[PDB]
Specification:
The structure is cut from a larger assembly and holds one copy of chain A (about 220 residues), two copies of chain B (about 110 residues) and two copies of chain C (about 100 residues). By secondary structure, chain B is mostly beta strands. Chain B has strands spanning about 5, 10, 20-25, 35-40, 45-50, 55, 60-65, 70-75, 85-90, 95-100, 100-105. In chain B, strands 2, 4, 5, 6, 9, 10 and 11 form a seven-stranded mixed sheet that branches. Chain B starts with a strand and ends with a strand. Chain C has a single domain, classed as Helix Hairpins, CATH 1.10.287.70. The radius of gyration of chain C is 18 Å and the shape is elongated. Chains C and D meet through helix 1 and helix 3 of C and helix 2 and helix 3 of D. Chains C, D: It is found in: Cell membrane. Chains C, D: Its main location: membrane.
Chain lengths: ~220, ~110, ~100, ~100, ~110
């Protein structure tokens, strides 16, 4: 491998500031430019600015309110973007990307999810979803878990620590009383459960919590 | 600044059909256009660089054509993994700019 | 190896260095200038060559002050170089014509 | 200091004077010509340099008679200068090759 | 001659909002656009030069962007002292020309 490493989330009180990072690995040339791109939920990609770390010059999108300052630490191959005096207009995902000086972004970070709110950080509760006593089984079977009452976004839900990709949906969170809620769903052959174990792992980057929860039949 | 227009905004196709995404730039930018794919909750991925040049790791299914102001990204025979947002991006003049996005719908 | 052949080689090396740095510095100067085209390294390198040779196709040129400053160094390096190859070719023809009269 | 090194320096001074006056006079000639772009002092100075070096990027050029007249003086000053640096580099190589055979 | 178009002619905004004035030139003029403010019964005052460069004495609140044919003057967070007419002006080609004017209304 992963060439750009960004933190998953930052919560910021309105008016405060925050310093996003982006550590690069792989080949680092002196010609390299690090770019930053803002994406509001359901909106498109918006170029914020660029820095060349070897020399230290940075240029910004003049067409938008200059909320940003770009810095870099040559020693640690890490680029910093300092967003200051944030409002809810500034809540978005912020990607960093690497450009070799040839005009295209070959590789991108996973992006950092910046939420501007006064509300407090809240880790989620993860509840199993197993079928009831009387649900009749098909050749498949559907399980899930209920990630309820967290703030801010996002959460990452995987199944069997990632080995279960075929058969998985994760629904968009709904917000209700400054607390987010979503659920995730998995489908496996009905034979394959519970004789083979099914666990959902829920990582909430903003609270640095990860939890597992296995899905067993209701006893 | 150069304005990249992506119309239409959604594209409905049937499976296995050929599909074409249009990028129009507000002035001539030669071949300095590049295409990205962004799946749901993913980050952008480079598909095509400099209008038509292939990226390794990217299906043969993806191609690009165009020069000047009209640019096209094409997918010979769509499939479900191709459902995503598709963005173009120019590097002819500072600053770099992005198209508004097109969703592929099967 | 006579002074004028090494000055020539020297200038060709020196010019290549100037072409390379010039590419890198042109891009550094021009990014941030809206409308600028001299903003990626491959084509700056082509630009620097067509600037040192004074061919001026006008496909690319700088629009900022320091880009233009960078451009001037490249033209002068370019012109001095190609001029020194000439002064070098002349000392050769002149030496070969003084042997051609005995002297 | 030998004649050819001072002619060179002289020409470089003289050329800089011509570049400066040329800037000022180009703007004076071109204002009042509809469509003219050679009409502010900073970019005339850049124009005069690219005219003396004969790089011709075609980003700026005169469209009036006296502007074009001004342009010709700059090209000829520019070309004569860079040519005199060459004639100067040749006398140097030629003197250094006549010491290199005893003479 | 270059024709500078300023539409719309009036701009109604609420206090503290961000406001943007559009200058479109009839051909590409690079960044040789400059912005003036003229309050009621006052003379014009320079706000922005060469599309985006700041003038000292002028609030941080004022910014400019653009190149070629599309130019924008912006005010992050309008206030009452900003009520005036706003003109653009090009110096790319002789003769200099002026935009028709936009009034800011709170």
């Amino acid at each position: 491998q992963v060439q750009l490493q960004q933190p998953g989330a930052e919560l910021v009180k309105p008016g405060a500031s925050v310093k996003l990072s982006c550590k690069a690995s792989g080949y680092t040339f002196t010609s390299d430019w690090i770019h930053w791109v803002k994406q509001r939920p359901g909106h498109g990609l918006e170029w914020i600015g660029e820095i060349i770390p070897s020399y230290g010059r940075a240029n910004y999108n003049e067409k938008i309110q200059k909320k940003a300052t770009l810095t870099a630490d040559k020693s640690s191959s890490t680029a910093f973007m300092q967003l200051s005096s944030l409002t809810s207009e500034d809540s978005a995902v912020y990607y960093c990307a690497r450009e070799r000086g040839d005009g295209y972004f070959a590789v991108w970070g996973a992006g950092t999810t910046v939420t501007v709110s006064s509300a407090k950080t809240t880790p989620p509760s993860v509840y199993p979803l197993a079928p009831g006593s009387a649900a009749q089984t098909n050749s498949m079977v559907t399980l899930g878990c209920l990630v309820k009452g967290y703030f801010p976004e996002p959460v990452t839900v995987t199944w069997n620590s990632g080995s279960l990709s075929s058969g998985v949906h994760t629904f968009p969170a709904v917000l209700q009383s400054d607390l987010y809620t979503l659920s995730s769903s998995v489908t496996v052959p009905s034979s394959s459960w519970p004789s083979e174990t099914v666990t959902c792992n829920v990582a909430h980057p903003a609270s640095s919590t990860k939890v597992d929860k296995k899905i067993v039949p209701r006893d | 600044d150069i304005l990249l227009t992506q119309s239409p905004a959604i594209l409905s196709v049937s499976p296995g059909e050929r599909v074409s995404f249009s990028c129009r730039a507000s002035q001539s930018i030669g071949t300095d256009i590049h295409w990205y794919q962004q799946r749901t909750n993913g980050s952008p991925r480079l598909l095509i660089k400099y209008a038509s040049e292939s990226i390794s790791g990217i299906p043969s299914r993806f191609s690009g054509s165009g020069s000047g102001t009209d640019f096209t990204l094409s997918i010979n025979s769509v499939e479900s993994e191709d459902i995503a947002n598709y963005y173009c991006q120019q590097s002819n003049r500072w600053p770099f700019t992005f198209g508004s996005g097109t969703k592929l719908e099967i | 190896s006579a002074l004028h052949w090494r000055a020539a080689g020297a200038a060709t090396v020196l010019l290549v260095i100037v072409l390379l740095a010039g590419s890198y510095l042109a891009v550094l100067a021009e990014r941030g200038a809206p409308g600028a085209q001299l903003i990626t390294y491959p084509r700056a390198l082509w630009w620097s060559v067509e600037t040192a040779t004074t061919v001026g196709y006008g496909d690319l040129y700088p629009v900022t002050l320091w880009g233009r400053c960078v451009a001037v160094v490249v033209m002068v390096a370019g012109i001095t170089s190609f001029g020194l190859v000439t002064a070098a070719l002349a000392t050769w023809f002149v030496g070969r014509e003084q042997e051609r009269r005995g002297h």
